[PDB]
Design an enzyme around this catalytic site. Structure first.
Site, PDB file in Angstrom:
ATOM      1  N   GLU A  36      -9.373  -7.553   2.381  1.00  0.00           N
ATOM      2  CA  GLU A  36      -9.245  -6.733   3.340  1.00  0.00           C
ATOM      3  C   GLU A  36      -7.612  -6.013   3.687  1.00  0.00           C
ATOM      4  OE1 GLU A  36     -11.900  -7.474   6.846  1.00  0.00           O
ATOM      5  OE2 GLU A  36     -13.130  -7.781   4.852  1.00  0.00           O
ATOM      6  N   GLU A  65      -5.817   6.926  -2.243  1.00  0.00           N
ATOM      7  CA  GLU A  65      -5.785   5.845  -1.379  1.00  0.00           C
ATOM      8  C   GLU A  65      -6.468   4.636  -1.925  1.00  0.00           C
ATOM      9  OE1 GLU A  65      -5.247   4.990   1.821  1.00  0.00           O
ATOM     10  OE2 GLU A  65      -3.757   6.752   1.886  1.00  0.00           O
ATOM     11  N   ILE A  94      -8.137  -9.754  18.298  1.00  0.00           N
ATOM     12  CA  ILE A  94      -9.476 -10.098  17.799  1.00  0.00           C
ATOM     13  C   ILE A  94      -9.238 -10.548  16.321  1.00  0.00           C
ATOM     14  CG2 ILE A  94     -11.509  -8.831  16.684  1.00  0.00           C
ATOM     15  CD1 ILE A  94     -10.839  -6.368  18.829  1.00  0.00           C
ATOM     16  N   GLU A 134      -0.292  -8.597  -2.016  1.00  0.00           N
ATOM     17  CA  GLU A 134      -0.625  -9.765  -1.125  1.00  0.00           C
ATOM     18  C   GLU A 134      -1.073 -11.243  -1.894  1.00  0.00           C
ATOM     19  OE1 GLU A 134      -2.520  -8.774   2.327  1.00  0.00           O
ATOM     20  OE2 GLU A 134      -3.919 -10.326   1.968  1.00  0.00           O
ATOM     21  N   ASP A 185     -10.004  13.886   7.680  1.00  0.00           N
ATOM     22  CA  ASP A 185      -9.066  12.893   6.951  1.00  0.00           C
ATOM     23  C   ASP A 185      -8.890  13.548   5.494  1.00  0.00           C
ATOM     24  OD1 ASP A 185      -8.197  10.401   6.202  1.00  0.00           O
ATOM     25  OD2 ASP A 185     -10.088   9.756   5.832  1.00  0.00           O
ATOM     26  N   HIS A 242       1.943   4.506  -2.958  1.00  0.00           N
ATOM     27  CA  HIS A 242       1.752   5.779  -2.818  1.00  0.00           C
ATOM     28  C   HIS A 242       3.077   6.653  -3.477  1.00  0.00           C
ATOM     29  CE1 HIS A 242      -1.537   6.577  -0.653  1.00  0.00           C
ATOM     30  NE2 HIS A 242      -1.391   6.121   0.644  1.00  0.00           N
ATOM     31  N   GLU A 263      -4.902  -6.936   7.961  1.00  0.00           N
ATOM     32  CA  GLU A 263      -5.356  -7.788   9.054  1.00  0.00           C
ATOM     33  C   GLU A 263      -4.392  -8.637   9.770  1.00  0.00           C
ATOM     34  OE1 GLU A 263      -6.050  -7.799   5.460  1.00  0.00           O
ATOM     35  OE2 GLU A 263      -4.703  -9.529   5.066  1.00  0.00           O
ATOM     36  N   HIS A 287       1.063  -1.219   0.064  1.00  0.00           N
ATOM     37  CA  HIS A 287       0.127   0.001   0.082  1.00  0.00           C
ATOM     38  C   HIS A 287       0.787   1.239  -0.135  1.00  0.00           C
ATOM     39  CE1 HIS A 287      -3.484   2.343   1.432  1.00  0.00           C
ATOM     40  NE2 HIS A 287      -2.530   3.172   1.541  1.00  0.00           N
ATOM     41  N   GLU A 288       1.951   1.586   1.078  1.00  0.00           N
ATOM     42  CA  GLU A 288       2.552   2.563   1.170  1.00  0.00           C
ATOM     43  C   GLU A 288       3.547   2.973   0.052  1.00  0.00           C
ATOM     44  OE1 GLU A 288       1.681   4.796   3.048  1.00  0.00           O
ATOM     45  OE2 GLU A 288       0.015   3.825   4.167  1.00  0.00           O
ATOM     46  N   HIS A 333      -9.550   8.138   3.214  1.00  0.00           N
ATOM     47  CA  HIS A 333      -9.415   6.866   3.735  1.00  0.00           C
ATOM     48  C   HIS A 333     -10.971   6.374   3.861  1.00  0.00           C
ATOM     49  CE1 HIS A 333      -5.508   8.383   5.433  1.00  0.00           C
ATOM     50  NE2 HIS A 333      -5.064   7.006   4.975  1.00  0.00           N
ATOM     51  N   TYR A 376      -3.602  14.541  -2.590  1.00  0.00           N
ATOM     52  CA  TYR A 376      -4.156  13.836  -1.566  1.00  0.00           C
ATOM     53  C   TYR A 376      -5.018  14.760  -0.681  1.00  0.00           C
ATOM     54  CZ  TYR A 376      -3.686  10.050   1.964  1.00  0.00           C
ATOM     55  OH  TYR A 376      -3.926   9.151   2.795  1.00  0.00           O
TER      56      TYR A 376
HETATM   57 CA   LIG Z   1      -6.903  -8.582  14.640  1.00  0.00          CA
HETATM   58 CA   LIG Z   2      -5.046  -8.119   3.170  1.00  0.00          CA
HETATM   59 CA   LIG Z   3      -4.200 -11.777   4.275  1.00  0.00          CA
HETATM   60 ZN   LIG Z   4      -2.571   5.213   1.698  1.00  0.00          ZN
END
Ligand SMILES: [Ca+2]
Ligand SMILES: [Ca+2]
Ligand SMILES: [Ca+2]
Ligand SMILES: [Zn+2]
Ligand SMILES: [Ca+2]
EC number: 3.4.24.27
Length: 316
Positions: free
Chosen positions: A187, A166, A197, A177, A226, A146, A190, A142-143, A231, A157
């Site tokens: 997601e 974003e 959690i 991933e 934001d 950018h 995570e 992700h980063e 986001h 931005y």
């Molecule tokens: Ca968690």
């Molecule tokens: Ca993920």
């Molecule tokens: Ca994953």
């Molecule tokens: Zn970002």
């Protein structure tokens, strides 16, 4: 630093053992000479002065818990480098093999990770909301994305261009991933989010609303927090990208999914050929439609699916 390319071994944040490309000159440094003009990982030593010191290790073994975040920052930078090169023929973030620099152990209990204009920076988290953020390949990618955006479209931005900026990072973080193919999903964050959690994350692309993000233009956030919701409103574009890839019926609008590789091709092309600093959501739809047309033809399923996906999220 000048020295020979070596190969170390250590454990990442989640306790997984992996090899890392290092450089030897008295100490073994986190400097990977095998990709472009190098990948360099530094220690911020719980401070915020950047970059810190190039990571130096006595024996080329990186199994201490303090080592873990640096192992991951370095290794997942290499995975992200490989993705852009092998999949998109892009050499590093500037397209000219710029050195990739990352600092870990930024500040104390810092629940965040970011690209500061020149390098990657990762907090260690506070152990409750986050563990060290470089343990998430989607966070790393992700980063770094950018950085790619800053050298290409230059999406400002803020407001809609900001929400696109974003979304683009959520999209390629997720595609990276899947490329690395360890527990991939739609997601974000995570693997490092809330150790107590199960099954949660910061954001969901398949169901933005799970965490209160809009999944349709009519639900866009129009306030000032934001940076005008960068986001928050990314959920609308994330949902569209999810639909283009996987398909589904969303508010009554059916989308035929064309898969992840094609989503990646269409959005990389939009990013690098069509989007500009002030692009809004509607202009993104046109860029994505024109990209799909260039790649697969104007009468293609691919083009029809892009149109359906943006229709589904209220973007005309
Ligand atoms: Ca968690
Ligand atoms: Ca993920
Ligand atoms: Ca994953
Ligand atoms: Zn970002
Ligand atoms: Ca060591």
């Amino acid at each position: 630093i000048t020295g020979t390319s070596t190969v170390g071994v250590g454990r990442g944040v989640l306790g997984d053992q992996k090899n890392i490309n290092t450089t030897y000159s008295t100490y073994y440094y986190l400097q990977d000479n095998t990709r472009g003009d190098g990948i360099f990982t530094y220690d911020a030593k719980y401070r915020t002065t950047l970059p810190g010191s190039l990571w130096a290790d006595a024996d080329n073994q990186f199994f201490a818990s303090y080592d873990a975040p640096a192992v991951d920052a370095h290794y997942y930078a290499g995975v992200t480098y490989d993705y852009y090169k092998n999949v998109h023929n892009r050499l590093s973030y500037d397209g000219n093999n710029a050195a990739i620099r990352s600092s870990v152990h930024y500040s104390q209990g810092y629940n965040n990770a970011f690209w500061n204009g020149s390098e990657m920076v990762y907090g260690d988290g506070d152990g409750q909301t986050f563990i060290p953020l470089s343990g998430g390949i989607d966070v790393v990618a992700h980063e770094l994305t950018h950085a790619v955006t800053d050298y290409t479209a230059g999406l400002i931005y803020q407001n809609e261009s900001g929400a696109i900026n974003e979304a683009i990072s959520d999209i390629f973080g997720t595609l990276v991933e899947f490329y690395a193919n360890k527990n991939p999903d739609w997601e974000i964050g995570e693997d490092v989010y809330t150790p107590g959690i199960s099954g949660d994350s910061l954001r969901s692309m398949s169901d933005p609303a799970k965490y209160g993000d809009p999944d349709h233009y009519s639900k866009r956030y129009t306030g000032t927090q934001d940076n005008g919701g960068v986001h928050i409103n990314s959920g609308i574009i994330n949902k569209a990208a999810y639909l283009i890839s996987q398909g589904g019926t969303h508010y009554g609008v059916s989308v035929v999914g064309i898969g992840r590789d094609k989503l990646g091709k269409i959005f990389y092309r939009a990013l690098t050929q069509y989007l500009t600093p002030t692009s809004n959501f509607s202009q993104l739809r046109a860029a994505a439609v024109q990209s799909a047309t260039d790649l697969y033809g104007s009468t293609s399923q691919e083009v029809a699916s892009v149109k359906q996906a943006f229709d589904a999220v209220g973007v005309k």
